[PDB]
Amino acid sequence: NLYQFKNMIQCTVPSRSWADFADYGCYCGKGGSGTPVDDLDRCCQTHDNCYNEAENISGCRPYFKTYSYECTQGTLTCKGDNNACAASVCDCDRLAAICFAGAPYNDDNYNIDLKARCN
C-alpha cells in the first residue's frame, strides 16, 4: 500500500521528500493518460500499468493491499510470505522506487496542468 510505497521512496531516495513525486508529469500521482513528459514520468507510467495488471488478480487492490517488505542498509526487499497479489504489488512499487532513484528530476514537470497536457 501507498503508505509502504511512501516508505519505499523514502529509503531509496533520501534527499528528496516523497511529496516531490505525488504530483509530477502526467503519471506521477494524478491519474494520467497521454505521453509521459519524461523519464521520471515514464517510471510512473510503468508504475500505473503495473497496478492495472495487478487489478486483474481478483480481490487485489494495489492501493490498500498491505504487503511484506523491508528496507535496510540501502536494500529494498519484497519478502517471501506474500501471496500472488501482495507480491505483485510489492514488486510494482519496488521497481518504481528503484526507477525513481535513477531518473532526473525536472521542476517544470511538477504539477503541470493535467487537463490541458493530458486529456
Binding site: 501507498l2 510505497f5 521512496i9 513525486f21 505525488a22 506521477c28 508504475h47 492501493y63 518504481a96
Partner: peptide, 5 residues
C-alpha cells in the same frame, strides 16, 4: 491523507 502514484 493521499496518493503518490
Amino acid at each position: 491523507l493521499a496518493i503518490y502514484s
